[model samples]
Target: TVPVKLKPGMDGPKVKQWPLTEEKIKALVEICTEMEKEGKISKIGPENPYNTPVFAIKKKDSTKWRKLVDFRELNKRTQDFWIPHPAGLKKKKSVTVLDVGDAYFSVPLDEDFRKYTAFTIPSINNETPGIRYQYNVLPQGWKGSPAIFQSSMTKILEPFRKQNPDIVIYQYMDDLYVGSDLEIGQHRTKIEELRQHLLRWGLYTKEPPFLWMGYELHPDKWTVQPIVLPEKDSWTVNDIQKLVGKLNWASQIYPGIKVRQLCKLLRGTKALTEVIPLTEEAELELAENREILKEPVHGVYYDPSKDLIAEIQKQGQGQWTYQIYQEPFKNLKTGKYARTNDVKQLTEAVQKITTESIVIWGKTPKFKLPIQKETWETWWTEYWQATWIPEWEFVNTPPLVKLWYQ
Candidate 1:
C-alpha cells in the first residue's frame, strides 16, 4: 500500500525491537488506538502491503517516548525536497521557540494517499492488534514531510503573516520559532495562536523512563548474558539498510563504539529488498549489543565506553547497573548467597554451592531479566573453560553450570 511495486523480490521489511522498543510498543499501541477511536486518524485496509519499522526512544530523564517511523524504503522511492532554514530573516531582536504537538500527525492526508501509509500491527491487543491501519494524517519521518509541513504551516499562517508584518515565523523540523523586533513575550501570543491552530506543544521535556537505572556502567564494565530467541528472526535488505544507516549515523556521533564487522555486508547495501542472514554467533552479538539489554543482569552494556556511559548518565537516563563484578559481589562477602570477586573466594563459593540445589548467579536485575538458561550457561562455561580452571579441572563446569548440567 506504500505506493511501491517490488523490483522482482523486493519487499518492505519489518523493524527489529530491542527491550525498550518492545515495551514502548506495547505502551504506544494503546495510545494509537485511542487516537484512532477519537477519529484523529483512519485506515484504508486491514494491513498495508508495505512493512516499515518504527522506533520509539525514551527521552533522556523523561517518561516521554518519541516515536519515529522508518520510511527509508518509501523515502528512496518518493520525491525529495530541500526545506528552508530560518536564516533569511535573522535580524529580529526578539525570539520565541514553539513546537507542534503531534506535528506531522496534525497535517491531514489525502484520502487516496492515506492507504500508502497503511501498516499492520502485530496484534498487540485483541481489539486493535494485527489489523491494517493507514494514517489519515501526514506521518513523521517522511522525506517529504518537512517540506510539506512547512508549506502547510505557511498556508495556515498566510492571513496572519500579512496581518502582522513584524512577526517573521519560520520552522526547523516540527519546531516553529518566531523572530521579531518585539522582544521578550511580545510574539509569544502569535506562536501560541499558531500552535493552537496546528494543535502542538509548548515546551516538551519530562522525567526519566522506568527502565532507567543509575550511571556507573563503564565501557569496561562487563555483565554475563546469554542470547536466546523465542521464534526465528532475521533482517531483510530493507531492515539491514535502515540498520546500517542508523549505525553509520551513530558511529559518527559515538566513535568510541564500533561494530565494523557486523555492519560490513550492510555498508554497501542500498537496496531495500536485499537479504542478510542472522548467524547464531551474530545473533548472540546482536542481543548483547542491545543498547539496554536488560536491567541489572547479563549482557549489561558490558563493553560500553566510559564516555558513552557518562553521556547517558549525563541526561539522568537512570544510571547504569552495578557491574556484575560490583554490587556486593566483589565488594563484600556472605550477604545473601554472594561472595567477593576474588578468584579464590569465587572458587570457594562455587565449590561450596556445588552441594546446593540451585545458585542464582549475578545480581537480580531491576527489570524482569528472563534469560535463556542455555545462553547464560553457555557464555559462563565458554568464559571460564580454561581461563582459570582448566577443562580437566572440573566434572561439569567451573561449577557455575552444575545446576543446569546436573
Candidate 2:
C-alpha cells in the first residue's frame, strides 16, 4: 500500500503527530542494545546498525523530520512480492508460516485518520462560505509516515524474528506477512504474540478475507465431495448431468469455488450431454436447456425467488427432506426454505449478498462473453498482473504533495 500525502503548503487539517522524540529514540536504542546484549536483536555491525533509527518528514515546511515515519518507497518496492497465506501453501508438504504480530507503528495516527476519508463535490444548494466543502479532501500521501510506521513495526517484530530464527517476517509499511514451517500451535502462538505487540504499538490488522487464513473464522459451504478428486472414468451424459446437479447443490461448500472451477466443469458437462441425440424435438429442447445452464453460477449469487423458495420448501417437506434439509436452516422443520430458479437472478443476488456481508467485496461484475470457450488460467494471469495490480495501486497510491505550489 502507498503512503498518504498532503498538498504542499496546505495544512488542511491537524493530524496526530508521531510521538517519536529524542528520548523515545534513545529508549528504543537502549532497549535494542540490551536485547543485543541478551542475544535477542541481531548484532549486525558497528557501521551498519541492525536496528536502524526511523524518522518522519512533516508537511509543515517539509524540512524537519516529523517523528512519523513514511514507507512509500519500501511499499512500492515490496508490492510485487507475494505474502504467503497463513493457512499454508497450495501443495507444499511443510508449511511456510509468516508470524505477523510483532510489527508496530512508530507514531500512532488516530484510529479515525486510518479510515479512508472520501472528499466529494458539494451539492450546489449546500454550497456556502462557512460550510461549503471542496472536492479537495486532505490527501493521505505522506512521505515519512509509511517509513516511520514500517520502522517501528519492524523494530517491535524484529526481537521476535531474532528470538524465533525459523520464521521470516516481511514488513511492507503497516502490512505485515510472515512465513515459517513452525508447528500449527507455534504459528498460532506467534500470531497471538504479534497481535498483542501491535496493540501495544497502537496499530491493528486489516486483513481482507481470502488473503490470510485462520485470522478470522468463516463458515464453510456444504460439499458432497471434494472438487479436486479425480473425475470418474467413462462418464455418460446422465453422469455429467448428475455432476452438474451436484455442483449446483454443493454451491456453498467452498467460497469462490463455484464460479472458478465447478461452474466450468458444469458447463463442459452440459455441452457434452447435449451432443447425444435422442430425437429432433428432444435435441432442440436439450439445446435450449443447455443455453440456460451455460452461465456462471455461485452459491451467494443464487437468488431464490418466492416461487423457487416455495418449491424448495415443498421438496424439503417431501421424501428428499433429509437430503435437502441441512443445518444453518432458518426453519429446518418448517421446510420453508430459499432457492433460486433463474441463473441471472441467482448471480445478482449472490453478488449483492456477498457485497453486503463483506464475503466477496471489491470484485468486478461477471463479464458476458460470446459463445466460445476460454481458459481461465490465461485470463487470470493477465488480469492479476495487469488489471488488479494497477487498480490496487491507484486506490492505494501514496499522497504526493507538489514540491512547490506553482
Candidate 3:
C-alpha cells in the first residue's frame, strides 16, 4: 500500500462536478461501475469534505470513453515524493514489452490518506443529490502515483533481476522492455518464467507489443523508429510542447538532428491554449522531421566488445553532426583492424610534432603552401639531422620488402 501525505497546512478544495451530457453521464457510470466491481473505489457518505471532479474523455481511435479524475487541486496540495526509475524505453536486440494490467489499482492505499482521494459522481434524475467515493487503491491523475507505482514494481522485480543477471528489463511505470542476449527461442522461455512470477503476485501480464512509449521498436531490424504525429491545421502551445518532447527523444538516437528550428515557434507563447497557425516555416520543419523518421536510419544494437567510432564534427559555429563508424582502419603488415583508441594516440603524436615545427619556422602558413626553391633545398639539406626525421619516415613509409609490393 502507498501512503500519500499532504503538505503541512495544505488542504484541497472540494471541486464541483463537471456538467455532463446524457451520453457522457452514462459513460461515467459505466466506468465507475467497473472500478467498483474491481474494488478500486468504494461508496462513501456525501459528507466527505474533499471532492474532486471526474470526466469521461474519448479514447484514441476508439469509440469508448476513458475516465479521468480532476486531481489537479488535490495534487497541488499533496506533498511531492520522487523516486528514480528508468527514464524512457530504449531499443534492445530482441525485446518484448510487458504491460501490467490495472497497474495502479494493484496496490492498496493507506487507509488514513484515502479521504484525500474522494471523487463525486452526479446523481441521475432527481432521486438524490449525488454520490461520493474515495479510491481504495492508488488512483490516476495524482502526481505521486507514477513514482509510487514505479518504486513498487522495482521492489518486486529486484529479486528476479538479481537472480538472472543476463536478461535486461527496462521498466517505466506499467510498461516494461524485456530483452536478452540469448537466442529468440531461449529468451521466450525466460520471459514466460518472469510472467509466471508476476501472476503469483496477482499482476497480470499482457504479452506482446511492437509500440512502446511512443516509439515503434523493431526487433527484426533492431531499429527504434519514432511514431509519426497526426495531421493538424494548427497547434496550441501544449501540442507543440508534446511534439518537441518526442523529437528530443529521437535526437538521442540520431544525435545529429537539429530541433532548435522547431522550438522557435514557441518563443512568444504565453498560454497553453494559445493556438499558432502552421506557417510555411513551421510546416517545412515538421515535414522535415517527419520525413527523417519515415525510414529506419540506423540499428540501435551493438556488441560492446567490438571497436566502434562515434565521430562528431562541427559543421559551423553552432551546428554539429555525429555519425557512427565501424572499425575501418587496418594494419597492412598484420592484417589486423586498428582500435579507435590506437588511432587517437597516433594522431595526437603527429600533431604535436607538426605544430612545434610550424610554430618555430615561418613556413606552412595557415592556408597557402610554401615550396620555394631555395627554402625547399635548405630544408632537405638539413632534414636528416632533424631529431624527428626518423620517426616521421618510420610512420609514413610503407614496407618495401614484402613480395606483393615488390
Candidate 4:
C-alpha cells in the first residue's frame, strides 16, 4: 500500500494543514464514517500498509466541508496521461462539452492499488486516537488516479464513439466533451443522447453542454471575463474599393486623375494623420487668417511716407474710380500670396511635377509607418486575406491545433 516513492526528485515531510475549525473536525469524521458504512472505506486494524495524512477541504461552491486525504507528496509519484482534446472544434462558432456530477466515481480502481490510497481519519471529539481506513474503490488525491480513471472512461465511451463518428467525444478521465461542426446549437440533440446513455452508469449530469468547455457553467461558479478590443485596427481591401466605387468608369471614368488620387488617399487611410498646427484655437485662427504668415505686419504703419490721399488727389481720383479701395486705400498691406513659409513648407497634397513623385510642400513631414515591419505585416495580412482569402480562407495559422501540445 505504500507509494513506490513520495516523489522522484522531492523529499517527503508531513504536510501543514490549511486553516479548518472544530465544525470541520466533526464533518470529517461524519463523512469518513459515512464512507466506511458505504464499504468504500474500511476501519483499519493491525494492518497498516501506507501512511497518508487527512484534512477537510471547503467545497468550491459551498460552505460545507468534505473529508480529504492530502496526497500531494504521493501525487508526484502517480502516473499522468495527457489524453488530447479535440483540436479545431473551438474554431466553430458553437461547441458542446457535456459534464457529469461525480463522474469520476463511475470508474473503479484495482483492489491492489486502493490499499496505497488509504488515509488516516481523525476521531470525533479527540476520542483516544485516530482511526485508519483503506479505500476499497478509487479514492481522490492519488498520484495516478486521474490517469487511471481517464483510461477507464475512455473504454466506457468507446461504444458511443462506434455508434456515431460525426459525434466527436473526448475524455481525460471524468471530463467528456461532445461536439460537432454543425450550426450553432445544433449539437444539443447529440448532447441529450449522450446524457441518456451516461445515465446508465448512475451518473446524473451536472449540466448539459458546458459553455466555456473547461470552466464552470454552474450559475454559482459562473463569472464574466474581461473583453478587450484588438490592439490594432485595419480595413479590408474591399472597404477601399467601396469608398471609391461611385467615381468614374466603365470602372472609374470621366474626371479621371483626381478620382484615382481619391482612391489612393482612402487606401492610405490606415496610417495617416494630418500634420496640422498644434492648438485647437490654431485651427480656428488659421481658418480665419488668409495671409496669417505670408505677409506679416512688416513694420509699424507710420502713416505711409507720402500721403495716399494726396497722391490720389493729384491723379484726379483715377478715371476708373470704382474699386481702388480693394488696394488698401493708398499704401497699405493686405497684399495677396506667397506660399506661406511656416517652416520648411513641405508636403503638397495637390502637387506640381510628375505623377510618380509627390511633394510635401509644408512642414515637410517625412511620414512613415512607425513600426514599419510590424504594421507592414499587419497590412500584408489585410491585403492577402482579402485578395487570396475567401474561397481559399487563408491566414497565418492552422485550421486546428491539439490542445495537449501546449
Candidate 5:
C-alpha cells in the first residue's frame, strides 16, 4: 500500500463542509455509491475529527460530473513529493494513446493515512451536517498522490519496456503514447501486446485519442486551441479564475503567447464569487484573448537534428527576454525567415540621437577588476552551454547588431 507522510507536528484542522445544491448532492451520492461498490471508499461515522469538503465540478460537456475533494487544508500539512513527468514527444510519424481507466483508484492507500483523507458530502436534501466517507485507495487532490501513483505505474511498465526495446512509449500520468516513426503493422502488434499486459494488471486501456495533454497532437501538426467561453453579461472572480486557468495551460504549451492584461484583471479581484465591474480595459483584454482563441495556433515539433538559434532582445523599460528557435524559422504568414523584436530595440539602436544628451561617467575609470576575464568567460559560456548551441565560432564571431530601426 502506498503511504503518505505528513510533516512533524502538522495536524490538519477539519474544514467546514459547505451545503451543496440538489443536483450536486445527487451527483455526489451517485459517485459515492460507485466508489463504495469498488471498495475504494467506505462510509465512516460523522464524529471523525478529520474531514474535508467534497464538491462536484461539471465536466466541459456538462453531460457528466466529477467528484473533487477540497484537500487544500490537508495538503498544507502533508510533506511534498515531486513527480517527474517525461517531456512531450518531439517527433513521431504516427501515435496511439492508451489511457489507464481509473488510474488513481488502482493503488491502495496505507490504513493509517486514510483518516486524514476523509471527505464529507451533503445529504440529498442539502443537509447542514454531511455524511463522511474515507478512501481505501489513493485519492486525487492530495499533494503527494501523483508522485506515489507515478512511481507505482513506472514499476508496472518496467518489465514490458525491457521486453520490447524498439517500441517508444511516453507516459504522462495515466495517458500513454505509443509512437512509431512510420505507421507499420509491427507497431500495431506491439500496441496490442502492451494493451493486453496493462489489462492483466486490472488497468483497462481506453482506446484512442487524438488529444493528449491539452494538445491536438497529430503526425505533422499539433495545435493549442482555447475553449469557447460561457455566455455571461458580467463575470465573477470564479469565472475569471477558470478562464485564466485554461489560458495559463495554453500559454505554457505556447510560450510565444502572452496574456498580461487578462492576468491583471484576475489579480485585481479578491473574492472568488464576487462579481467585478468590467472596465473598458478589461473588456478589451477579454476581446483580445477571444480573438486569439478563435483560431488554433500550430505548435512546432522539436527536431534534434536542426540547428538551434538563441536570440536575446531588450524590451520595454530595460527588460530583456530571450527565445530559442530551430533552424529555418518560418513566418506563419509570409513563410519566410522571421525574428521577434520590439519598439525598445528600435528606440535604443541610435546611441547619440540628440547632441544635448549628457554623458554618464563610471567610477571604475581604469576598469582593473581582479576576475574580469574569469567572470566574463563564465557568464558567456553559461548561456551557450545551457542551450546546447554549438560554440565553434565563439572566439571569432563579433557581437554585431542589425540596425533594422534605421
Candidate 6:
C-alpha cells in the first residue's frame, strides 16, 4: 500500500550509510559490555511484567459482567514519598554563581531525503547549520530533561568533587552555584580549579558581570549595586532615589540612627519644595518612567540656563521620611557611622552598644518616638543575627544554669 521508492531527497545534510562490518560489531559489543559493567546499561526489557499484565479479574454475577482486579492501587499506596532531591551544596554558607557556558551542538540529516525535501526541512531552509539533531530525536518534550541535564552536569563535576571535597557544586542548567567555608584566598583557588576542569571539557566560564556571589537581586524589583558608589560622584536626584531604594533594603541590616543620617543626605532640596503627595502606584510609575528626570520644574531653577530639575519632590508630609525613621536597627554600626570618624572604633562601639541595648530591652521590647524598638529587635533577630554567632560563649564560661544561679 506504500510506494517502494529506494531513496527520498531531503533539504538537510544526508545521513551517511555505513555497512555493519565485523570490526564495527565487535567494537559496539565491547563498548556495550564495558557500559554494562559500569552499571550504565540495564538488562531488563522495556516494560516490567507487573506493569504490563493483570493476574485476576473479578466477574460479577450478571450477563458477562467483569471488572479488572488491578493491584496497581496497592503498589501506588505503598510508593515512597517523593521529597525533592536537594540541589547542590546542602551546608553552604554562601552561594557562588558560576556560568558554565552553553551546550554543544551537532548536525543530523538523511542524505537521500535532501534531493526531494530540501525546502521542507526547517533548519535547512533557515540555513542553521550544525544544529543538534539528538536533542530533537530524543524525548525533548519529556519532563525528565531537567533531571537528565542535572545528572549529566553532576557527572561532569564528579572529578572536581574528588579534587576539592571542601567545595560543593550545585548546578541548574548552565548556571552553577558553588560554595565553601573557604575565605577569599581559598575561594579564588577553588574557582580557578573549577575553571580549569570546565575548560578541559571544552567549556568556558564568564567573567565579572556574568558571574556573581550571594543572593541575586530581582531585576524587576530593584537595581543591583555591584559596588558602593563613591561620594565624590555627581549625585543626581535619580541617584538619591536609587540610594533611597537601596537604603530601604539596607535598613533591615542598618541601625535607625545610621539610616536617618543616610535619609538626610538623600532627601536633598526636594524635601523643602512643595510636598507632592504621590500614591504607591504613582511613585512606581514615576520610577519606571526614566524620562521623568527630564521634566521641567516651575519656579525652582538652581541653574536657569540648564534643564529644569525633574526632582521627585518629597510626598505625604514626610510619611516616607517617617517610615525610614521607624525602621529597626541592630547594635551593628551603619555605613554612615563608619563613613564618619574612625570606622573600626565606631563599629566596635556600635556593636557593644547594641548588645547592651538588647540585654536591657530584653530581646524584644516596645519603643516610643524616634526609635521603634520592636522593628529594631525584629531586624536584629532576623538579619543582623545571621552576621554573628548567637549566644556565643567564651572558652572559660560556666554552664548557663551555673551562671544564672551564681
lDDT of 1: 0.40
Model 5, range 1-406, lDDT digits (tens) per residue?
A: 8556788788855877766667777788898999999898998885568888777755432365667676767866887663222233434555565545356787788888888888887765553556678988877656555567777677777888788755556754334666655456666667677777776764432433222221222433432223355557788888877766666655644454456765677775389888867777767766776666565456654444444333333333534322234433321111001122332232222111100010111000111111234343333221111101111112212122111100
Candidate 3 lDDT over 1-406, as tens digits, reads 6657888888766877755556767787888888888888988875678888776655433455656677767776888774222212222455565545356776678888888788877766646676678988877656566567777687778888898877667653334557665677777677778876676654542432222321323333422223455566678888887777767766654455566777887887469989877768768878887777665445544333443332222222332222333332211011111122322323332322222222212111111111233342223311111111111221112221111110
lDDT of 6 by residue, 1-406 (tens): 1111222331222222122223333343454344346433323332212121111111122121111112222222221222122333434444455544232111111232112111111122344421111112101111122233444466667888887787656543234556676766677666776776776754322331123323321212211112132232344555555555654543344223133433455444674333334445434433433232222212321221221110011112221110111123221111111122222232233333322222222121111222233333223221121111112111222232111110
lDDT of 3 at 364: 14
The TM-score that candidate 4 achieves is: 0.40
Shift in Å, residue 179, candidate 5: 5.4
TM-scores for all candidates: the values are 0.38, 0.28, 0.42, 0.40, 0.44, 0.26
Identify the runs in model 4 with alpha carbons over 4 angstroms from their true place. Answer: 1-13, 45-70, 79-82, 89-116, 120-132, 141-143, 166-168, 180-189, 201-406
Q: lDDT tens digits, residues 1-406, model 2?
A: 3344343332233222232334434443554444345432233222321111133222222221222222232223222311222223211122222223222322443333232221111123434311111111111223234454554555656677688766544432223445455566776666666555556545443321122233421212212211221145554556545544544433444322232332333444354544332444433433444444333222322222211110110122111111111223211111111343323232223222222122211122222211122232122221121001111110111111110000
Write down the lDDT of every candidate, Cα atoms only. 0.40, 0.30, 0.53, 0.38, 0.52, 0.31
RMSD of candidate 5 to the true fold? 22.7
Error of 2 at 304 (Å): 45
lDDT ranking from best to worst? 3, 5, 1, 4, 6, 2
Report model 2's TM-score to 2 decimal places: 0.28
What ranking emerges by TM-score with the best candidate at the front? Answer: 5, 3, 4, 1, 2, 6
Q: What is the lDDT of residue 89 in candidate 3?
A: 20
Candidate 1 Cα outliers beyond 4 Å, as residue runs: 1-23, 39-49, 57-66, 81-86, 89-96, 101-132, 146-152, 187-190, 193-406
Residue 253 in model 5: shift from native, Å? 20
Model 1, residue 224: what's the lDDT?
A: 34
Residue 205 accuracy (lDDT) in model 5: 20
Candidate 6 C-alpha error for residue 76, in Å:
25
Q: Cα miss at 168, model 2 (Å)?
A: 1.8
